[PDB]
Chain A
Amino acid sequence: SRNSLSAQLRRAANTRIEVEGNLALSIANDLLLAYGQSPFNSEAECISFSPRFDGTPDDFRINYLKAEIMSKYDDFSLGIDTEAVAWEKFLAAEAECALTNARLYRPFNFSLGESCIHMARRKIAKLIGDVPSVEGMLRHCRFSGGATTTNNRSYGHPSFKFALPQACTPRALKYVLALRASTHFDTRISDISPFNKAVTVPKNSKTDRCIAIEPGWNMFFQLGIGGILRDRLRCWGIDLNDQTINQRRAHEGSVTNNLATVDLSAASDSISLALCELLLPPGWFEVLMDLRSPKGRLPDGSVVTYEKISSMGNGYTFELESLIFASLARSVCEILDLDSSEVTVYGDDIILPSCAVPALREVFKYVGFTTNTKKTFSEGPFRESCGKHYYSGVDVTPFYIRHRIVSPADLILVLNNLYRWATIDGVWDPRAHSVYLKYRKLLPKQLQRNTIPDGYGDGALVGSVLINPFAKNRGWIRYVPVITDHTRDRERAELGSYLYDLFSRCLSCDSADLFAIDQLICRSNPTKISRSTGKFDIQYIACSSRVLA
């Protein structure tokens, strides 16, 4: 006997979207029709459509949306085993490193590959020194919020990493022991084992992605290495905390054609032990070898002895590959008389002068990397880096529908992505609008009208907040209801939480006005654990409307 707006909204959010067939596919096909493109004839066409890198930007932008939009949809019935496909590639890459490890440890003959290794070795040494410093490890070691061999996702919070004894490899034991000696708290090891756990996460409709879950103490120290590398790379003008650098350089390359964007075909699994030993100072290599996991256990129980140095889940992998790709790209520049500060890297994503590319491909073949010609761009109007895609200066970044659209929140996310893609300054491209209004009708009535401004997430439809009948101005602040994941409280590990806090606080154009003000805010937040139930809730947040022109 009390249907408040808040209860009404919650009821609406907890219904299911009822529709015949693949809703995602229907939305995408109506979108293509509205832009005068042919629709996808079948699910098979969705994942195998190639765009043409010519035409006006308008033509290309929708054509590219077409090639991408259902590229990652995870609910097709094509009988593709995306896990088995991944494990196949995983074995192939490992076999690849095997060859590389042997060729590189193998004995006047002259070579671009060897020369770049020689030059990169010397430059890396100047950059990172002989051995990782104690000060750096002290500043950068920490636990992450991810799984470890002992902690599944729900026990992933750092407080549980201090609370539960973590595993470690034989070579990492002395690191744990040095940590243990330095504190009165006791740090416990659950088991000593050389195995990490290999598994698959989603990537696209054709194949999963292989990753590793590390022993937690190893991870703790890997992150130390990762942090140090990230600091040092700044001296090469590479900031691994800022993806926008690469994004802009991609845009620039799409206009000037003087910069190339190079995609490395998951060569984050092709970094061989041999290459690292040749490029890194012996002190560093020893440490990388101490902290990696030498072996893996696959989901089916079979084991692997790793030919590569490490894989995506390791806490220094992202930084190590950045260092390795950068140093090679910069030596290729030196070799060619190009300015090596023209090189930027962000993990897998490399940007350097278009003229260097052919030489880079040769060096990369030689060190056991496999360059994907289709995603490497050194001419033509198109470039792409770090999530942004450009065609002659025009932003043509697509959006993706990843999952079966089931709940109103799913549909709102899709509609909001359409909005962001199809509007300019809040004004709709009429072609996309018609599709948006059509599919908006599938939402429960109240959620059709409940709008928020852009930049406030996807718990409601992006639109104008001033016409939202559910928005309420209280004490001159406007509050708007948004859909959230419904959760239940869990108890935090009390001592684990204390160590996390104590460890974190002990491990340590701006106007002067808002700078001193920012200093006011305490940045630490108490540990609070929740489990999400699968249901939806409603929460009121403070909102500012879009500004006037």
Chain B
Amino acid sequence: ITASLVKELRERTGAGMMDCKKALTEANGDIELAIENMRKSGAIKAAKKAGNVAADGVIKTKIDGNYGIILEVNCQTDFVAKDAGFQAFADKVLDAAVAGKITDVEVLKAQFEEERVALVAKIGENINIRRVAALEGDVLGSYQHGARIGVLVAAKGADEELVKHIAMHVAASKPEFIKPEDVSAEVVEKEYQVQLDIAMQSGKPKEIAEKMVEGRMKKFTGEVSLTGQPFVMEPSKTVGQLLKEHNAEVTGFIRFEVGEGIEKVETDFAAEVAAMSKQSKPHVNVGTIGHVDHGKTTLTAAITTVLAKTYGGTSHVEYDTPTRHYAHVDCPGHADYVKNMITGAAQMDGAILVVAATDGPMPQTREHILLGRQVGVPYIIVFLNKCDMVDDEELLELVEMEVRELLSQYDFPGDDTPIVRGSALKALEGDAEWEAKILELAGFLDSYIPEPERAIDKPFLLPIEDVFSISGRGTVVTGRVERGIIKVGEEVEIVGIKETQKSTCTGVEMFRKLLDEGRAGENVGVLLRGIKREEIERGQVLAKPGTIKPHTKFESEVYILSKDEGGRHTPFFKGYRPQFYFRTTDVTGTIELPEGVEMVMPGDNIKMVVTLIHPIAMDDGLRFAIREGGRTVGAGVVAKVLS
């Protein structure tokens, strides 16, 4: 049983490293029997994962003429939902449902159970076909809002685009029924006999409560039915009114949303770490990413434990080395991390990719790495976990190399990536040989991730909040020094909104003292030579000359608040025109949506190309808010400067 042979069975199988070593053992060096043994042992592997909650996955729709299918397939993480192999499975299932008009979920399940088991075998998450449904009508339309929401709509006397718009509406407004009358009339007469008790306790006349409940029940029934809902593309009119205008009729509709009605058992990363932990200067932000079973949480508890033991001391964890303070988050979800990054709730300086050496990279491991690329994480360090459960050291080298090449495929320095070979379990138990690996990993955090740049070390910048003309002295701007240092006698530029102007700092001032300089963090008045008050305005910045430029057009990564986060409750579309808040002021802009995106819902992550009415000092990384009349409804990060 050579490492070379195990490798052979690996790329033929996709099964974990040790699974191959083992199966190549009880089958002798016979690769073919090994294939069969593992393929046979798949059933139990899938059976073991079967207890795992799986609330992620995809919705799929497909229309062929007047017959349409909508399908849900689940998994554990959105990383796996994005994976090509998972996607292939679901598309295959979907295609089979359409071709054989299969609407019985059990026939569907039973027909793909072998592939499912084989897919769970190599992906390592509990994957399941959940539900499947079909819809027919004169005209069929569909809308996918990413992977999460699928809609089928059947109509009559309506054209293709009308149906598409209705589907988009259904996706956003979730009607339960078509028309108010359709509401299970017996399910609301109990709620009307429940409601009028509530009302009739004030001692308020019989007639009053009944009459009020009746009126309440009427609009409650309106909002839950298509017909009664404000059309999302024109809220001043209901979908019912829209339909009459087109002499059309909605026949039926189906809305699936991934995970609908499945528990939703949230996780407390920090506490799970502390729990696990018990039974057993520069500030740097890091995060763990990797497969659900590969011990990210165990590793984190081992890190906190060993570092505390050795050095003494947004659900996050904290730990210190002699030279650094670390904040540590987990990255279980792609969309979730992207959103945290955009809003500034989270921001990695480095990532720790956790791979169990017992398996080696999973298929979704590229998705884990691709996330790093997408949010532009500068550095990735690898922790190879469960190394105590691996006998042959040359197999460890096999895994190492697989990881390095994956990293290089996505433009990380695979060949120069620090890779620690450790054991979170063994270190957490107290075996010193393994604790040494934890310390080694912390050594790499210290050495491989550069200390992020301090504001005081950046070129001078002060966002201008107000401008004054002091008789007998001259012009003064006020603000908080955002970065760098401004000294009396130095030249400055006034950047943004207007043509750039130049001036000279003739003084720096606080309420109690005149100063020679202003430094990052400090609130000050900066006196300027020559320039007049009416030549400056809020929204411009003071900067060291040449260090920042004004721009009108940029690419951005944007998060749109959900209703509950106090943002919008309706979607917007192509010509959305809100205010963009940069540092001290709102600026009006227009957006271009990405190719193929037509609707944006509250709670969405989305990239937009923004064009501002006038220029604004900015560079890559500048965060901004999106506003409607002073109310914040979104947040953005400038990703690339354009025109």
Q: Are B469 and A506 in contact (CB-based, < 8 A)?
A: no
Is A501 engaged at the interface, CB distance under 8 Å to the other chain? yes
Answer whether A475 and B576 are a contact pair too, CB < 8 Å, given A498-B476, A514-B566, A526-B465: yes
Q: Which residues of chain B (566-623) have a CB below 8 Å from chain A?
A: 566, 568-573, 575-578, 581, 583-584, 590, 623
Is B510 engaged at the interface, CB distance under 8 Å to the other chain? yes
Interface flags, A393-414, vs B, CB<8A=1, else 0: 0100000000000000000000
- Closest Cβ of chain A: how far from B636's Cβ, in Å? 10
Most buried by A among B207, B346, B523, B561: B523
Q: Are A61 and B480 in contact (CB-based, < 8 A)?
A: no
The A-B contact count (CB < 8 A) is 168
A58–B201 alpha-carbon span in the complex (Å): 9
Stretch in A164-172, A347-355, A465-473 with 4+ CB within 8 Å of B:
A465-473
Query: Chain B's interface: helix, strand, loop or mixed, by majority?
Result: mixed
- Closest Cβ of chain A: how far from B634's Cβ, in Å? 9
| Contact residues in A for B578 (Cβ distance below 8 Å) | 475, 477
Query: Chain A's interface: helix, strand, loop or mixed, by majority?
Result: mixed
Q: Are B465 and A524 in contact (CB-based, < 8 A)?
A: yes
- Closest Cβ of chain B: how far from A479's Cβ, in Å? 8
Q: Are A505 and B343 in contact (CB-based, < 8 A)?
A: no
Is B514 engaged at the interface, CB distance under 8 Å to the other chain? yes
Set A56, A467, A495, A511: member contacting B471, Cβ < 8 A: A495
Q: What is the number of residues of chain B that contact chain A, defined by CB distance less than 8 Å?
A: 74
Is B36 engaged at the interface, CB distance under 8 Å to the other chain? no
Is A522 engaged at the interface, CB distance under 8 Å to the other chain? yes
Q: Are B577 and A501 in contact (CB-based, < 8 A)?
A: no
Q: Are A473 and B478 in contact (CB-based, < 8 A)?
A: no
| Closest chain B residue to A546, Cβ basis | B569
Is B311 engaged at the interface, CB distance under 8 Å to the other chain? no
Is B216 engaged at the interface, CB distance under 8 Å to the other chain? yes
A522–B586 alpha-carbon span in the complex (Å): 11
Q: Are A474 and B212 in contact (CB-based, < 8 A)?
A: no
A497–B471 alpha-carbon span in the complex (Å): 13
Q: Are B468 and A494 in contact (CB-based, < 8 A)?
A: yes
Q: Which residues of chain B (210-243) have a CB below 8 Å from chain A?
A: 211-212, 215-216, 219-220, 223-224, 229-230, 234-236
Answer whether A476 and B573 are a contact pair too, CB < 8 Å, given A57-B202, A427-B215: yes
A11–B215 alpha-carbon span in the complex (Å): 35
Q: Which residues of chain B (292-343) have a CB below 8 Å from chain A?
A: 314, 339-340, 343
Q: Are B202 and A58 in contact (CB-based, < 8 A)?
A: yes
Stretch in A64-72, A146-154, A428-436, A439-447 with 4+ CB within 8 Å of B:
A428-436
- Closest Cβ of chain B: how far from A68's Cβ, in Å? 18
| Closest chain A residue to B230, Cβ basis | A466
Set B339, B470, B577: member contacting A513, Cβ < 8 A: B339
Set B469, B510, B538, B629: member contacting A541, Cβ < 8 A: B629
Answer whether A522 and B523 are a contact pair too, CB < 8 Å, given A61-B202, A512-B314: no
Q: Are A466 and B236 in contact (CB-based, < 8 A)?
A: yes
A517–B173 alpha-carbon span in the complex (Å): 27
- Closest Cβ of chain A: how far from B48's Cβ, in Å? 36
Q: Are B512 and A182 in contact (CB-based, < 8 A)?
A: yes
Interface flags, B197-208, vs A, CB<8A=1, else 0: 000001111011
| Contact residues in A for B581 (Cβ distance below 8 Å) | 520-521
A518–B569 alpha-carbon span in the complex (Å): 20
Set A61, A428, A526, A544: member contacting B569, Cβ < 8 A: A544
A18–B8 alpha-carbon span in the complex (Å): 95
Set B202, B211, B568, B624: member contacting A520, Cβ < 8 A: B624
Q: Are B511 and A507 in contact (CB-based, < 8 A)?
A: yes
Which A-B residue pairs are the 8 nearest by beta carbons? A56-B203, A475-B577, A542-B629, A476-B572, A516-B344, A512-B314, A506-B511, A512-B345
Known A394-B202, A477-B577, A499-B511; further 5 A-B contacts with Cβ < 8 A: A59-B203, A501-B478, A518-B632, A520-B581, A544-B568
Question: Mind listing 27 A-B residue pairs with CB under 8 Å?
Answer: A56-B203, A57-B202, A58-B205, A61-B202, A183-B512, A427-B215, A466-B230, A471-B236, A473-B236, A476-B573, A478-B235, A498-B476, A501-B468, A505-B480, A506-B511, A508-B523, A512-B314, A512-B346, A513-B345, A514-B561, A519-B344, A522-B584, A541-B629, A542-B628, A545-B230, A547-B569, A549-B224
